[PDB]
Amino acid sequence: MENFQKVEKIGEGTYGVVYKARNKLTGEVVALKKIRTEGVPSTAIREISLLKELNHPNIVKLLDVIHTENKLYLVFEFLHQDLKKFMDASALTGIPLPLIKSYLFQLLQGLAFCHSHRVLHRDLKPQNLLINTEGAIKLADFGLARAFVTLWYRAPEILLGCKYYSTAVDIWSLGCIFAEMVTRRALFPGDSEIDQLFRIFRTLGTPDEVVWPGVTSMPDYKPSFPKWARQDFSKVVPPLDEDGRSLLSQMLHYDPNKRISAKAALAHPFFQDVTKPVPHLRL
Ligand SMILES: O=C(Nc1c[nH]nc1-c1nc2ccccc2[nH]1)c1ccccc1
């Protein structure tokens, strides 16, 4: 678009590339996202116009939606750094737990907000979680999935062929990120759909009708699925204290219906002593 001067590519999103750009008129720096050709379906337009409404302190604000020359651009407020870069930058000493807890609390609030509006993210990952110098973290790419690649944070029901998943898939994704921040290593680093699923099974044990009633008749479930035993969280996420492990385990429940909500999670004892530390980031 003419009213923007790309400064650089800051990422390769799902539905198009993201650029840091400066508005030629206002002068403000922003994050410009180019979408994707039939001319941009109507349904897409409206889904996008709704996302322009749900504003929350923990959600990257969608400033303007530009549909020019049958092209689609989303203009989002610009954030200082993504969670991924900050995580890598903290691989030596690790993110202070008080900061980890603050980031989780905020993210859960964002999801809580989105879920109450029946809007799901569906593709949460360290790359689309954004942070700023003020101690804040926000969700980006929200609602775009519906409107319109790592498998590490994908919920088991999505891997098993379930077509009408719920908001609980986001809760699962967040739990995987929560653990990653704590251990400084990906929880389930799969490299193909079956490897992802089996990595989950190996750590949490293969699901059955007991822990997940109905799992055995899901579209892609195979009874030939190996039978792995469930590992203890003390081995999976040290040095996470008990309240943390207790919370993580509920975020990682197989049955999407037993999986903790963002709402309930915010009331978990893990957040009783939550503060809002400021990060030491290099821009
Ligand atoms: O939308 C994405 N990112 C952003 C929106 N506003 N500001 C940003 C942003 N991303 C950055 C990455 C590195 C350093 C600074 C950044 N500011 C987005 C969506 C999907 C994948 C990647 C980025």
Tell me which of 53, 80, 107 is where a domain ends: 80
Q: Please name which of 84, 200, 86 lies closest in space to residue 152, comparing C-alpha atoms.
A: 200
Q: Please name which of 37, 43, 62 lies closest in space to residue 148, comparing C-alpha atoms.
A: 43
**78-87: burial string, b at 16+ Cβ within 10 Å, e else:** bbebbbbbbb
Q: Are residues 130 and 75 in the same domain?
A: no
What span, in angstroms and rounded, lies between the C-alpha atoms of 246 and 268?
9
Q: At what angle do helices 168-183 and 97-115 cross, to 10 degrees?
A: 170
What is the SS3 assignment for 77? strand
Q: Does the Cβ of 233 fall within 6 Å of ligand 1? A: no
Cited resolution, angstroms: 2.2
Residue nearest to atom 9 of ligand 1 (CA): 79
Residue nearest to atom 21 of ligand 1 (CA): 13
Provide the CATH number for the domain around residue 72.
3.30.200.20
Q: Does the Cβ of 102 fall within 6 Å of ligand 1? A: no
Q: Does the Cβ of 83 fall within 6 Å of ligand 1? A: no
Q: Does the Cβ of 196 fall within 6 Å of ligand 1? A: no
Residue 184 corresponds to which amino acid?
Answer: R
Catalytic, 64? Answer no
Q: Are residues 110 and 211 in the same domain?
A: yes
Method: X-ray
What is the SS3 assignment for 130? strand
Task: Record the tokens describing residue 151, joined without a space.
Answer: 């498998």
C-beta atoms surrounding 176 within 10 Å: 23
Q: Are residues 89 and 161 in the same domain?
A: yes
Of the candidates 123, 170, 195, 241, the residue annotated as catalytic is 123
Q: Find tokens 């967040």 and name the residue.
A: 174
> What domain count does the chain have?
2
What is the SS3 assignment for 72? strand
**Nearest atom within ligand 1 for CA of residue 33:** 1
Q: Are residues 66 and 101 in the same domain?
A: no
Cα 227 to middle of ligand 1, angstroms: 40
Torsion 32-36-40-42 (CA) sign:
negative
Q: Which domain holds residue 205?
A: 81-281
